[PDB]
Structure 1
Amino acid sequence: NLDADLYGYRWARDNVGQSGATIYRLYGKPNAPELFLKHGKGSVANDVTDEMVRLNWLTAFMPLPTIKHFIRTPDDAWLLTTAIPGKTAFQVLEEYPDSGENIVDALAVFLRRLHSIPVCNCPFNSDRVFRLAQAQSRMNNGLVDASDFDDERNGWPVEQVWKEMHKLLPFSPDSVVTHGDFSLDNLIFDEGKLIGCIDVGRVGIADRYQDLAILWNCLGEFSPSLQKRLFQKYGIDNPDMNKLQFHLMLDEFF
């Protein structure tokens, strides 16, 4: 069982937009750090499982929550991790908009760090063909949230987004180690420093634009100038807009 690690903590049920899994926040225990327990049943358990192995693999390189405990049974996955103290990049942007330049600088450096991890270390695949297949299996089961499409695709039928996506293909792949969901909700700041990332479930090998696109979009809600810096700090001279557009369209399906 699990209980030894759970005496003393009190419980809260977070909703961070998290696909499928129930997230409990464990707190209140003195001399003990906040904890998260992710719980997935049925198919979603696979997803909790995927995150555990990636947390476990990736922490050899980046700063992650540590796996205090994981349980898999035929239909249920439970994942207990330590919390990363701090606020999301998004919150820190909102609260201190005269700090965006250092936050985007920090985000780029960090993303460069992740991507510099040599692929020969990484046992996980998440290239477009993998994701594309996944995206179809969510389209053709009507799980794609058309409500949440980016503005330039607002109210489009899903089967359209799908069709317009394959027009940009093909592009030259480049392969690095990617986060999978490099959004402003998933990087944790504290005392001005970037100190860790969360939500590592889609981590694997893919085109860098998988991470660059998603973050660049999030900074769309603040300043086109902030978006520019992201690419500028990272060191790309001319953003591959085709690639950007493809990855943003692929995220629509998840």
Structure 2
Amino acid sequence: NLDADLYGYRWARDNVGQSGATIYRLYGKPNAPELFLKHGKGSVANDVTDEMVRLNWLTAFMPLPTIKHFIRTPDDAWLLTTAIPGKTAFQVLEEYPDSGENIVDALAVFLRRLHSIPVCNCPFNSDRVFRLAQAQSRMNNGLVDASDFDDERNGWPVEQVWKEMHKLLPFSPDSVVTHGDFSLDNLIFDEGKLIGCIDVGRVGIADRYQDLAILWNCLGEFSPSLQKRLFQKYGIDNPDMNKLQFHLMLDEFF
């Protein structure tokens, strides 16, 4: 029973997280760990279901939350997981601004690990043909947040982002297992160490720049040096600006 797993907890609601799911924090239970409960209704039920199976798969290879219980009915999905203790990379960077180089070094190592998983292990497709079709549909359904674009595209109609993006194509993918939202909010640090990642709903085979682009974008809030250091430590000396720009533009749609 979900009820059995939830008994005796205090409940909070967190406005946070990748999809439009409702996120609950369960805490304050004596002799019991903190948990998270994601609830997806309607279309969002699919997003939560997507995360569940990706968590179930990727846990063999990388440190992620542990699934405690999952339920799917036609219109609803409930995903109960353990909490990874600690703070986000973003939080720790703000708290220890002097540790930026160490934080990025750890992020590169972690990303290198993820990208070293042989793609023959991965039953999920997250390639650009798949994501572009997802983006087209989100745009057409009116779901794109046009207020949240990067500075380069501030005030751009979503249609212009779409058109301009297609001028970069095509390129041959350098396919690896990707996280899909490798941002500073989704990597968790605890006592100095990067100990896990969260929000794995977009995990699948894709170009390595899917992850590199999003993290590089985040680091741009802090330091051009930290952005360059990410590529350097990851093992890339000449960043592919076309692939970088493509993936930044694609993320505008999500």
> TM-score with structure 1 length normalisation?
0.99
Q: Secondary structure at the match of 2:141?
A: coil
Instruction: Indicate conservation of the 8 Å contact 2:12/2:26, yes or no.
Output: yes
- Per the alignment, residue 192 of structure 1 pairs with 192
State the shift of 1:17 in Å: 5.0
Q: Distance in 2 between matches of 1:7 and 1:52?
A: 22
Instruction: Report how far residue 19 of structure 1 moved.
Output: 2.6
SS for the counterpart of 1:26 is: strand
Report Cα offsets for 1:85-141 as digits up to 9, x if no partner. Answer: 000000000111000000000000000000000000000000000000000001011
Task: Mark the runs of 5 or more structure 1 residues left unpaired by the alignment.
Answer: none
Unaligned runs of 5+ in 2: none
Whole-Å separation in 2 of the counterparts to 1:231 and 1:30: 44
RMSD of the alignment, in Å? 0.6
Is the contact made by 2:17 and 2:23 (CA closer than 8 Å) also made in structure 1? no
Question: How many residues are paired up?
Answer: 254
Report if the CA contact (8 A) 2:19-2:47 is conserved: no
Residues 34-63 of structure 1 deviation map (CA, whole Å, 9 limit, x = unaligned):
100000011110100000000000000100
The alignment's TM-score, normalised by the length of structure 2, stands at 0.99
Asked if structure 1 preserves the Cα contact closer than 8 Å seen for 2:46 and 2:77, the reply is yes
Q: Secondary structure at the match of 1:227?
A: helix
Shift of 1:171: 1.1
Deviation, 1:18, is 3.8
Measured after TM superposition, the shift of residue 185 of structure 1 is: 0.1
Q: Percent identity?
A: 100
Cα separation, partners in 2 of 1:190 and 1:197, compared to 1, 3 Å: same
1:31 is displaced (CA, Å) by 1.3
The question of whether the paired residues in 1 share the 8 Å contact of 2:26 and 2:36 is answered with: yes
Residue pairs, 1:1-254, within 5 angstroms = 1-254=1-254
Distance across 2 between alignment mates of 1:67 and 1:217: 30
In 1: Cα distance, 2:120 partner to 2:227 partner: 30
Distance 2:96 2:212 in 1: 23
